[PDB]
Design a protein around this motif. Structure first.
Motif, PDB file in Angstrom:
ATOM      1  N   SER B  36       0.734  -1.249  -0.153  1.00 55.90           N
ATOM      2  CA  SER B  36      -0.240   0.022  -0.104  1.00 55.90           C
ATOM      3  C   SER B  36       0.787   1.037  -0.015  1.00 55.90           C
ATOM      4  CB  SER B  36      -0.940   0.006   1.325  1.00 55.90           C
ATOM      5  OG  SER B  36      -0.196   0.443   2.405  1.00 55.90           O
ATOM      6  N   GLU B  39       0.998   2.411  -3.492  1.00 56.06           N
ATOM      7  CA  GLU B  39      -0.318   3.116  -4.071  1.00 56.06           C
ATOM      8  C   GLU B  39      -0.267   4.647  -3.896  1.00 56.06           C
ATOM      9  OE1 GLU B  39      -2.736   0.635  -2.194  1.00 56.06           O
ATOM     10  OE2 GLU B  39      -2.534  -1.279  -3.230  1.00 56.06           O
ATOM     11  N   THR B  40      -0.973   5.184  -4.918  1.00 56.07           N
ATOM     12  CA  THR B  40      -1.168   6.723  -4.910  1.00 56.07           C
ATOM     13  C   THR B  40      -2.642   7.248  -4.661  1.00 56.07           C
ATOM     14  OG1 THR B  40      -0.653   8.539  -6.302  1.00 56.07           O
ATOM     15  CG2 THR B  40      -1.349   6.632  -7.461  1.00 56.07           C
ATOM     16  N   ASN B  43      -5.677   3.897  -6.374  1.00 53.16           N
ATOM     17  CA  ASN B  43      -5.609   2.704  -6.332  1.00 53.16           C
ATOM     18  C   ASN B  43      -5.113   1.969  -4.975  1.00 53.16           C
ATOM     19  OD1 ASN B  43      -2.954   3.664  -6.883  1.00 53.16           O
ATOM     20  ND2 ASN B  43      -2.372   2.286  -8.186  1.00 53.16           N
ATOM     21  N   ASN B  44      -5.926   2.576  -4.001  1.00 49.48           N
ATOM     22  CA  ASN B  44      -5.518   2.358  -2.625  1.00 49.48           C
ATOM     23  C   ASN B  44      -5.913   0.591  -2.298  1.00 49.48           C
ATOM     24  OD1 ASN B  44      -4.407   2.814  -0.229  1.00 49.48           O
ATOM     25  ND2 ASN B  44      -5.634   4.035   0.388  1.00 49.48           N
ATOM     26  N   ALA B  46      -5.653  -1.957  -4.579  1.00 47.18           N
ATOM     27  CA  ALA B  46      -5.392  -2.690  -5.776  1.00 47.18           C
ATOM     28  C   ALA B  46      -4.652  -4.075  -5.596  1.00 47.18           C
ATOM     29  CB  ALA B  46      -4.639  -1.958  -6.985  1.00 47.18           C
ATOM     30  N   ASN B 164     -12.537   3.330  -3.213  1.00 49.18           N
ATOM     31  CA  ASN B 164     -11.388   2.765  -4.068  1.00 49.18           C
ATOM     32  C   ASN B 164     -11.694   1.205  -4.332  1.00 49.18           C
ATOM     33  OD1 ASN B 164     -10.096   5.088  -3.382  1.00 49.18           O
ATOM     34  ND2 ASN B 164      -8.129   4.254  -4.142  1.00 49.18           N
ATOM     35  N   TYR B 176      -1.573  -1.964 -11.627  1.00 45.78           N
ATOM     36  CA  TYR B 176      -0.919  -2.283 -10.634  1.00 45.78           C
ATOM     37  C   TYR B 176      -0.375  -3.466 -10.782  1.00 45.78           C
ATOM     38  CZ  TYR B 176       0.324  -2.838  -5.689  1.00 45.78           C
ATOM     39  OH  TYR B 176       0.730  -3.065  -4.397  1.00 45.78           O
ATOM     40  N   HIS B 180       3.602  -2.900 -10.410  1.00 46.17           N
ATOM     41  CA  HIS B 180       4.403  -3.174  -9.265  1.00 46.17           C
ATOM     42  C   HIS B 180       4.685  -4.822  -9.358  1.00 46.17           C
ATOM     43  CE1 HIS B 180       1.864   0.105  -8.396  1.00 46.17           C
ATOM     44  NE2 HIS B 180       2.892   0.590  -7.803  1.00 46.17           N
TER      45      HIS B 180
END
Ligand SMILES: CCCCCCCCCCC[C@H](O)CC(=O)SCCNC(=O)CCNC(=O)[C@H](O)C(C)(C)COP(=O)(O)O
Lengths: 65, 412, 178, 84, 63, 71, 48
Positions: B36, B39-40, B43-44, B46, B164, B176, B180
């Motif tokens: 987390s 994440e920005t 997309n909290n 995702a 989200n 994501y 990532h």
């Protein structure tokens, strides 16, 4: 007029070298001539007195008491 | 005499580590440096929703095919997500080592997110979040993270805001996933009855070609967070018990005095009272999580604070020796079981970049004495602004002046 | 100055453009030559290692700490060439670069002399008007099918057509008017 | 003197013939530095820089991320100083 | 170890700007786009200034 | 304009050679050193000493002084 | 200055020492400075 040279020591004209050595040599003749004729660069020509050798009579230092 | 953890690196960049032991029930596991924190706020959830969906459906294994395979050899399939790391691990037999690795390959790449499946999960996640509030200590630790790391990506939660979670697009997830899940940020860790050369072969065949190139060079980067001393006091007087967490800023993964701080925790009224050293990268939270009836939180806070100062001022050799012995029994090893050893490797290759052996841990434990323990405790506990998170009947929980001021003994 | 600016910069061009600023800001510190050529092949070493890092994150963490090492180890007065920005001779001979559309208001007496000059000038102006149509059409027929447009302009792609929007890259006032 | 192209052409050729990595008996205009002479991109930064110091001017970054044929360098340099 | 410290003057250089180094896909999308606005405007100046048969004053309405 | 044979230039015999040898100790090859050779190669090869410039022409200057002093 | 916090503010004992010592000297300075003012304000009127 001269020619461009690539990675070589540019050729020099007679005059360029002689004039350059001329101006510098006169600088040294003048410095040497004046130094001989007038060497007052050092000492001036008047010596500093030692202020600490003046007999107390010289300055009016009365005999203590 | 403990066998060494051997680490190799594949072109993709993913690190296929391993370990070997007489055991025959290996735990293969993929760890990814993605949580987390990366994440920005758009997309909290995702990583959580990909975790819930990753198992449910992959392109090669459609629908619930994977979960069948995993049933056929009798293996166990687990996954978890933290604020910094994501893990997909399988406990299986030794002789089923190839197919398990192949299964893990599907789970990290070639995964299929069925828009239908997406929907079903949305329900599962939303509902649980709707019932997750039930777990108080989780609520208190989330509140502590939020108020301690205000304005940073470390305040948010693994689950993410309900919004989200409601709004997620196969494409967002895809991002994501494609952003990532890079190969240099991946460790294939194996513990137990595995051979390293066989695992290294399997790694290439099934885990090669893992993506490594970001899109348009949108190479992620990271922010050193701020520890904002602050408090949060979710008052709800209908709850029977109160949960209070008090923390200060931790050093991080790579700072060795963590070991000394662990000894301090091993040295340390209100029902449960556990000490903790949450340590994210470049920051952490050293602290305590004490539950307590509404009428004793006050005293507890004082007791807790007292203990800390004692450790800043009056640490003796006997309690330091006791804390060292307590720490040296938290050593993770084959006797801890594969899954635990498995996990360590993955975390050690993700955080330290290497697997720290137990002999080095023992050396760093035995170099700790009382003087450097009270020095490091004065560095991290004395006259520091804490983060406070309370939930329940917390009216008698003291406000911020009484807590902070209590952190300094007028007598030193 | 000629080619158009790319939108975003890659990792490479950022690294490879430090190799220039760095080495060129190492030749202000190393005023001599043998010292320089030495202290510089040692620089490449720094860039030579950490060349094959595949871990982008790392690579962008070596780059970010390189350009801060550099900012604090730069020379205040580097060696910037003349005719380059900031340094002298940059806009020196621009007072004498008149823009060539000014020879069109010359008195018939002035243009009387210099006769063949204007005979060739009138040819080129015929070239310019003779293609504006085929050019703009080209510029358009080959227009982007998307909003993604870069300032790059197309070549000719057909005989007789003059590579477009060319009247001011050709017919540019000469650099040294002198 | 003003720079005639067939000279500038030889000058850029020459300097390269003094770079140790680039064979002196193959560098041939139109021999792309990277795909023919097989020089590292890191090198091309330098090859250009040598030229910037042989001809005394700066080939801007964006216009110099492309001086890879050993000839582009010979017309770009010439086009820059207006050599017809 | 002095860190450059941009002031309203002596601003943070392009390099040494954390933002620039790390950017999300969205950010690139922006930049890749802002060029478009500029390229568009550029190809609306460059074929109206390079237009033969023109005497009227290019206006530069942005001014 | 003809140009000196590229071969003429060589690093030995110049200060670049000593830089070359220490670079070789590290294992670096010092690739563009040959280009920077004509600096030290010839004509400009001789080291220039600070007294030499300050004392340029001193020899004749003193020779001139003596003569004048004589007359 | 982070030397202060480490040398003066950090330990209550040190926090104190600085206060007491400073106060010991402050009186000297304050009285001296204050007297200078008072007097000047009425320089003319005072015994001497
Ligand atoms: C005089 C001033 C002194 C300043 C010196 C300076 O501070 C010290 C310094 O530059 S520290 C250099 C380390 N800089 C890197 O390590 C970047 C590596 N970057 C990569 O490796 C790329 O990922 C890639 C694979 C594309 C390279 O490929 P390429 O051949 O460059 O295209």
């Amino acid at each position: 007029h001269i020619q461009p040279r690539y990675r070589e020591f540019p050729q020099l004209t007679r005059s360029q070298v002689i004039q350059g050595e001329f101006l510098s040599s006169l600088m040294w003749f003048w410095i040497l001539w004046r130094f001989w004729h007038d060497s007052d660069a050092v000492l001036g020509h008047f010596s500093y007195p030692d202020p600490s050798q003046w007999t107390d009579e010289e300055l009016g230092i009365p005999p203590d008491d | 005499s403990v066998p060494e953890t051997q680490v190799s690196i594949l072109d993709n960049g993913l690190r296929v580590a391993s370990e070997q032991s007489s055991h025959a029930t290996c735990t293969v596991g993929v760890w990814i440096d993605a949580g987390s924190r990366y994440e920005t706020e758009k997309n909290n959830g995702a990583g959580y929703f990909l975790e819930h969906l990753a198992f449910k459906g992959t392109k090669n294994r459609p629908g619930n095919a994977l979960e069948k395979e995993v049933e056929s050899i009798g293996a166990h399939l687990n996954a978890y997500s933290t604020r910094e790391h994501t893990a997909y691990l399988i406990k299986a037999l030794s002789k089923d080592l190839p197919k398990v690795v192949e299964l893990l390959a599907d789970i990290v790449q070639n995964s299929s997110l069925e828009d239908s499946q997406i929907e079903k999960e949305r329900d599962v996640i939303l509902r649980e979040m709707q019932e997750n509030d039930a777990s108080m200590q989780n609520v208190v630790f989330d509140y502590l993270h939020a108020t301690a790391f205000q304005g940073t990506p470390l305040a948010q939660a693994v689950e993410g805001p309900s919004e989200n979670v409601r709004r997620l697009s196969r494409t967002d997830l895809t991002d994501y996933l494609n952003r990532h899940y890079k190969a240099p940020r991946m460790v294939l860790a194996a513990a137990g009855g595995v051979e390293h050369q066989q695992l290294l072969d399997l790694a290439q065949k099934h885990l090669s070609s893992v993506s490594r190139v970001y899109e348009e060079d949108a190479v992620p980067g990271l922010t050193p967070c701020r520890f904002t001393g602050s408090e949060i006091r979710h008052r709800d007087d209908a709850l029977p018990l109160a949960h209070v967490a008090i923390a200060v800023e931790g050093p991080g993964w790579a700072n060795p005095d963590n070991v000394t701080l662990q000894v301090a925790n091993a040295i340390i009224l209100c029902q449960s009272f556990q000490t903790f050293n949450i340590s994210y990268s470049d920051t952490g939270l050293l602290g305590a999580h004490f539950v307590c009836d509404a009428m004793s939180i006050d005293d507890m806070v004082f007791f807790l604070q007292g203990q800390w100062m004692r450790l800043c001022t009056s640490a003796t050799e006997s309690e330091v020796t006791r804390g060292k012995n307590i720490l040296r029994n938290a050593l993770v090893s084959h006797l801890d079981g594969t899954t635990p050893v498995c996990e360590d490797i993955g975390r050690s290759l993700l955080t330290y970049g290497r697997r720290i052996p137990l002999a080095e841990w023992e050396s760093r434990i035995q170099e700790v004495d009382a003087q450097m323990l009270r020095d490091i405790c004065s560095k991290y506990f004395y006259d520091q602004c804490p983060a406070v998170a309370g939930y329940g009947p917390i009216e008698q929980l003291p406000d911020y002046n009484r807590i902070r001021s209590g952190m300094f003994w007028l007598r030193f | 100055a000629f080619c158009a600016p790319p939108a975003y910069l890659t990792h490479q061009q950022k690294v490879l453009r430090l190799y220039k600023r760095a080495l060129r800001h190492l030749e202000s510190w190393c005023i001599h030559r043998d010292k320089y050529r030495y202290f510089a092949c040692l620089m490449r070493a720094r860039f030579e290692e950490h060349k094959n890092e595949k871990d982008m994150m790392r690579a962008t963490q070596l780059l970010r700490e390189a350009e801060e090492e550099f900012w604090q180890n730069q020379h205040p007065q580097p060696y910037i060439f003349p005719d380059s920005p900031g340094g002298t001779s940059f806009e020196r001979y621009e007072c004498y670069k008149v823009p060539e559309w000014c020879l069109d208001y010359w008195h018939p007496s002035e243009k009387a002399m210099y006769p063949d000059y204007f005979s060739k000038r009138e040819q080129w102006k015929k070239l310019r008007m003779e293609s504006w149509d085929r050019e703009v059409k080209q510029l358009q027929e080959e227009t982007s099918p998307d909003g993604i447009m870069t300032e790059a302009l197309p070549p000719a792609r057909r005989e007789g057509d003059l590579p477009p929007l060319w009247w001011h890259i050709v017919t540019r006032p000469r650099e040294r008017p002198t | 003197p003003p720079l005639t192209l067939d000279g500038i052409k030889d000058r850029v050729l020459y300097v390269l013939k003094l770079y140790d990595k680039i064979d002196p008996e193959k560098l041939s205009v139109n021999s792309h530095f990277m795909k023919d002479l097989g020089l590292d991109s890191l090198d091309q930064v330098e090859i250009i820089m040598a030229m910037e110091d042989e001809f005394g001017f700066e080939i801007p970054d964006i216009d110099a991320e492309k001086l890879m044929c050993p000839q582009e360098i010979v017309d770009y340099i010439a086009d820059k100083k207006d050599v017809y | 170890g002095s860190k450059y410290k941009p002031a309203p003057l002596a601003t943070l250089p392009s390099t040494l700007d954390p933002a620039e180094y790390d950017v999300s896909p969205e950010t690139r999308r922006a930049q890749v786009e802002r060029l478009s606005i500029r390229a568009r405007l550029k190809r609306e100046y460059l074929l109206q200034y390079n237009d033969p048969k023109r005497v009227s004053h290019i206006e530069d309405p942005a001014l | 304009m003809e140009l000196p044979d590229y071969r003429q230039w060589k690093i030995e015999g110049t200060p670049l050679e000593t830089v070359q040898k220490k670079l070789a100790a590290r294992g670096l090859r010092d690739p563009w050193a040959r280009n920077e050779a004509w600096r030290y190669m010839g004509g400009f090869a001789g080291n220039i000493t600070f007294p030499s410039v300050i004392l340029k022409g001193f020899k004749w200057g003193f020779a001139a002084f003596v003569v004048a002093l004589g007359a | 200055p982070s030397r202060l916090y480490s040398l003066l503010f950090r330990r209550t004992s040190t926090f104190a020492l600085t206060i007491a010592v400073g106060a010991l000297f402050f009186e000297r300075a304050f009285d001296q400075g204050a007297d200078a003012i008072y007097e000047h304000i009425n320089e003319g009127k005072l015994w001497k």
